[model samples]
Each structure stands twice: as C-alpha cells, then as structure tokens.
Target: APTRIRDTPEDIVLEAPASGLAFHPARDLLAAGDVDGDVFVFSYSCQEGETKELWSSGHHLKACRAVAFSEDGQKLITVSKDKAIHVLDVEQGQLERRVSKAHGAPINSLLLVDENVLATGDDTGGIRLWDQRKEGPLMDMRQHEEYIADMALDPAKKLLLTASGDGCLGIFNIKRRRFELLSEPQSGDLTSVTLMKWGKKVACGSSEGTIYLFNWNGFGATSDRFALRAESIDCMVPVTESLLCTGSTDGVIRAVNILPNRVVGSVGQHTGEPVEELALSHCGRFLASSGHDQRLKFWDMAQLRAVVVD
Candidate 1:
C-alpha cells in the first residue's frame, strides 16, 4: 500500500473546450476532444475520487480537432469540425469507420504517422495523406494559409513538420510525397510542435510569446529564438531531449529547458483561462493540463524530472 502520492494531480472535469488531449500508449487511458462534439475516455487512478469516465463518443458533428490512440492502443482517431474522419472503439466507443470528406476545410491537424501512416491538417491550408488501409487520400497538399497549427515527426518518421496559422513552418517529405521548405514567417501564430535537441532542435510554439528554434537537417529559418514571456503558446509536450512542456495563453503550465534557455517551474495552472490541453503520458509519470476553465490539471512529474536540467 504505497501509492498515494499527491501534491496536485487531480482535477479532471471537462465539459467543453477540451482541445484534443489523448494518451493511452499503454493503458490507464485518457482521451479528450471537445468543443461541443464530445469524445472522451478517462481512467486515471492517482487516488482521490479515482477519476473514471471510460467512454463518451458523441461522434463529431462540429469541433474535435484531433484525438488519437492506435499504436496497439486499439484504434481511436479523431479530427473534425464535421469535415470528418472518425474511427473509434477504444473499448466501447463504437463506430469503427468513417472518412467522409476527410478535409476540404474544417480539420485542424492530426499526426499519427505510424502503423500505416496518418497525417492530416487543414481548414484552409491543407495537407492529407491517410492510409490506415485506405478510405481515400494518399496525398494532398496546399501547405498553409491559416489553420493546421501543429504536426511534427522527425527522427526518421520520414520528416514532416507543420505549424501554422499562416505564420509558417511546413516542411514535409512524408516518405517522398515531397514538399519540404517554408519556414520564415513568425511574429505570431505557430501553435505547437516537438522534436527537441535529441532530434537536433525544432520546437515551434508562439503567438508571439515565442519559442521557435529550428535546425534539424535545416529547413529555412529560425535557429533559436526563445522569448516565452507567455501571452500565448497553446500546447506542447516533449518530456525530454531537454525537457519542454508548455501550455500557456498566460494561465501558465511551463517546464522548459532547451539548449540552456531555462524557466523550469510552474508545472500547471489554469487560473485566468488559456491552457487548452497538454497531456504527456506513456509512463513519463503523467503531467496534464487543460483550460477554458473546465478544470483538468494533473501533474506529478516525479520530482519534476530531476529538477529539470541545471
């Protein structure tokens, strides 16, 4: 009986504004995607009321921009504004098929690049390539104008990176379906991305609060620029390769430490609004956040990851 540790990691209570937060790479599940079109599944056991809600699936009809889990997690991929592609059933969510339209608009980023490739991002600034055993689209690209604010995978996932709200950063090569270069407009709008120093740098997050380092087989700009005074940076989670865990629109949830630019504290909060999702689990000892004030703040980074660098 030695598992009752809590200092703060128990505030899961969504109802809306749950900007896609998924994590089930190996159980104790947690999947969210709300804005009006529900899709939930929870089961955290950090004690105290013992959170549990295992299944909601109101099946998209409006907002739900990305919620994935299918690398042996038993299928559950979502993306919609009703621009469709909803394959469910992570144990009772049902409806295991759908690909209607799949994006010609309304679909804001999803990247599950393994187990039969999957990468979508749109809402006017498209990029598609699905093949979870084909339902359509093997390739499509427009690149960016304003929507599709997040997607990243490099380290031989066959290079694919995009984060834009028209602020740019769309380097792709999705296993040679090619179109790799466009990274030179930033002052605001860039939302979230990963691949910190271990993959050799590339961490884009901004809304002008800045944190735009890019240099991993060189793209076209930014080689390091870390402002992070926070006024915006809506989600990011890359537990190591130099820490990196953020979710700020000012309500804070930061644990950054790249290349020496530090700010290692304030693990999670959603006080005055803005934190819109940040889930990092797969056994990194979990760390969660959500904002639109529907509460959902878990964090136990087990001594905050050895006190985060130096």
Candidate 2:
C-alpha cells in the first residue's frame, strides 16, 4: 500500500486563520485555532460524507495559537498569543476556567495528558505544566534557546517532551521534575516531535525538509535515530508505531516508512504554502491539515495506493 491524498469539495475554511491543530483522542473530532482568537471544532463523520461543526468560541482575547484534547477526550484546552490558557467543556460548549498570564510569551503549543492536567509552550522559550484543579504550576522548565515549537506528552499526563527553533529537544519527567536535552539531528529548527506507542518510539520533524526518528527513554534520547527527506516538516502524527503521516511547509503530506526513515509515498498540493498542522484520524484512516493558505483539507489514508486517494 502507498500514501494518497484526498480532498473533498465540502472543505471548511476557518475565519480567523491559524498555525496549529489537534485531533481528539478516541473520537472523530478535530479542533483548529486561529490567529483571530477563535476556535472551531469539526466532527468527522464517515457516514455523513462531511464534517460537522460542533462548536466555535472566542476563548482567547487575542489570537488562538494552540488547541488540544485530554487523553480521555473529555476536556478541550486551548492557549493563545494573549498568554492565556483556557479549559473548555467540549460537550456543553462552555468555558470552564481561564488562566491569564500562563506564559511569558505567546502560547504556541499545547499537550493534554488528562482532563485535569496539561502543558503549554511559549514564545519565550519556556514550558509550563498546569493542573485543572490547581491554579498554579505543577512544574516549569526552560530548555529551548528560542521559542518552543511543539511537544508530545505521554499518555499518563507525565513525561513531557518538546522541540524548539533553537534546534534542541528537551525531554521532561513531570513527576521527578527532571529533563534531558537531545541535540538536533539537523541544523535547522525542529518543528514537531511525537511520542508514540507509550514511548517505544519517537519522531521529529525539522525545518530543513527532514524528519528524525528515535527510541525514547525519559530524556528524548534515541538508540536508533535516522533522518528522512520531508520538505519543511511542520508536524507529524503517528497512527500506529509502524505507520504515520507528515505535514510539511511545502504543501505535502507524506506516508513515511518508519524503519528506514524514508518517504515511501506522498500526497501534495492541498495548499500553496505549508501543511502547517496535521491531525490523523483516531481510527487511522484519515488526516486533516491547515496552513498559511487559510484552508483546512482532509486526506484519506485508508486506501492502499501509491497514487492519490481520490
């Protein structure tokens, strides 16, 4: 089977525009954050042949920079350029609580481990942890020389890992409050890193059109690390340990072969710029991407084809 791209004519465009996206765990729901401070939730229904708009909110007073769901899919959390963190009641479409001044700079990335706790990345090169029940930080750390681009957390709400524009990956143990720094494989800024299969494997994407894979302990170290050519990889999502999808700044979505670290197949041209964000289906059959073009396109990954899925 090969990688393919599928874009439906019934595309849903965001009004605010954004650079981040997150898929709900165990559900067919996805959220996109816009620079205009708004959040839009889209429910993907296969039987419906389209996506349903579940809710829209002005959760942030400034641009909404990040959106994520708790591991249980019970809660939705968001962060913004306003330096605020918001927890939302997904089903009710209501505001739960707001944490103003959560970070020193604009919040760009978020990782929710559970309904009660999560983490956020700041433009100031800082990462902070928060508990839904507590008003203060559980733990905070600084590792990136510049802004933190993205991070992936383990399933237990502990173990936080981050990538930065400074070309470093910091792996953190939330409980012990310790971290390890792994040097960037490439010279460019790191875009995204994901902990897959309870951290048996790690994947990273970079600005130099390459993706790196690693074996994970607590400190983001890899026993088997390699690089694959993926132009300006902005984001990656692992549907399974062996298979995953990559969204690149070059407007390409690639179905990569993990073991050899190569682009076995690819799909492209959904946007003019980059596929800045990627959200894989919980069932491992579809992918959603948003980028500078202000369009959100859905691609089908279930088919076994080397050509386009359509």
Candidate 3:
C-alpha cells in the first residue's frame, strides 16, 4: 500500500485544510496558512518531541491562501481570499504591516524576491511586484488569461517563472524589471513550477499529468515533455539539484528526476485526497505534505532513492 499519514501521535496536526505551507529558509520552523484564515508557525527539529506550534495569528479576514517567510526568517507574510496581505513579526506574531485589497482579485501566488522585493499574483492573471519600503506596487501587469498556479525563481534571483491556468509558463526579467514572455500553451493548465538542473532548466507540472522541461533562456518553447502515470499534479518541491517531489490529485507524492525524466519513486500520500502543498525543511531532511485531511505529514528523506546521496 502507498504510505499514509504517520499514525505517529507525536506529529502535529493542522486545525483545518491548509492551502499553503512553507519551511523556514534557515531555521527549524515551518509555517502554514489554512482555509480559516489562520497562520501557524511550528518548531520541528526533524523529530517528534520538539514538534510544536510556536506562534500563530488569524490576520486574514477570509481564507489564507498563501504564506511565506522572509529570506532572513524574521517576518511571516500571508495573503488571503479577502484580498489583503499581512506581514507579521514572527517572534511575536504581531501584525507589523498590511496591504488591504492588495489585488483586484484574490492573491494566490507569492514569493519574496529579495529583502525589499516581493511578487504576487491574483486569480485573474494579475501580477505585481512590491517594495517593502514603498507605498505602492513597484510594477503591475497581467499577461495570463487565467490564475497564476505557481511561481519559481532562479538561483541568482534574476528570473521569475510563473505557471498559469492559461496552459503556459510566463517569465519576468526581475533584474531588468521587464516583462519577459510566455511559453506556448501545453495540453492544459500549467499547475506547478520549479527551477531544476542547477538553474539551467525549468520544469513545470501540468493539469494533464505531464511535466514539461524547458531550457532557462529557451522558455518560448519546451525542450522536453515527460508524461507521468499519476493524476493532475497539484504541488511540487525540489528535493535536490536534479530531483523534484511532486504532489498529485491521486493522493500520491512522487519523486521525479529531470534530466533522465522519470518518476523516481513514491515519497508519501494524503490518503486519497489531492495534495494541497509540499514543503522541504530548511535542513533538507523532511518533506511535509498536507491536503483535505487537515494533517501535516512529514516524510523522511531516506524515503527517496536519489536523495540517498543528497
């Protein structure tokens, strides 16, 4: 049978189905935002005894759709269906700043570009880049005909690649502050995206149960297409420089390697519910997954075949 939730009583469970999960960049903590507009930051030392929710807040008036930590791990940022953005002081869980009605529509995609920069996307393809110290968005544009399913940045943070429901991947030249371009649409919506192959290529998961690969500078068209045997891919995370962990609608989390282009093995599952999010711990030893089950399940890195060398 496929792996199920840890039946391990020591694991911390979520109060509601979470739409977002982010592991701290450099600490032993993880943050998640639920459908109830609640954000929880938990401390987990990749073990059981230390698993605990450190601090939390319900700042979003509506469902909190996404959550992320600043590069320095000092701030927790969250966006909601209420169309607001809340930046909280991590240690105190206090609202430090907020942007009301941040987008004309619900903000679904978010990523910190730098200490002072952030990028967000609305339901209808509206994308905006903000400067934390500025009063308004530094840049705003809409090029996709549908929602921004996901977004990824390069190693040097020079490019921002976005997966959209328009069945294509869009690019933003971050360093130059310019609208790059969009790739040709595939069979269906581009569901998830990430930078792989040492930042030399990009891999995007699609609604059609396929993963498309593209050369960094050659986003105009795909370099390769490797179909998967699973249902639609709903979430994904990079396990190593050459491998990716993808969550699908079929309730299976797959470990996929890019260059050779194949599903390496199964990491874990959500007990038949589609996976909502996947987060790799800062230490790269744990992969936590959550979905309709309202459970945050952690899988050890030893579960993957390629990551034995990671």
lDDT of each residue in 176-294, candidate 2, tens digit only: 76665655434767888887545677777788866665666634444554555644777887755666777876777877756645565775546557777888766666677786778
* lDDT of model 3 at position 217: 95
Each candidate's TM vs. the true structure?
0.35, 0.86, 0.93
Best model per lDDT: 3
lDDT of 1 by residue, 205-241 (tens): 8887788888887768888887877778878888878
Candidate 3 is scored at a TM of 0.93
User: Ten residues in a row with the worst lDDT in model 3?
Assistant: 1-10
Error of 1 at 285 (Å): 17
Per-candidate local distance difference test = 0.82, 0.73, 0.85
lDDT by residue for model 3 (146-214), tens:
999899987788888899999989999787777989899888789899998778889999888899999
Residue 228: error of model 2 in Å? 4.7
Please give the distance, in angstroms, between residue 237's alpha carbon in candidate 1 and its true position after superposition: 4.6
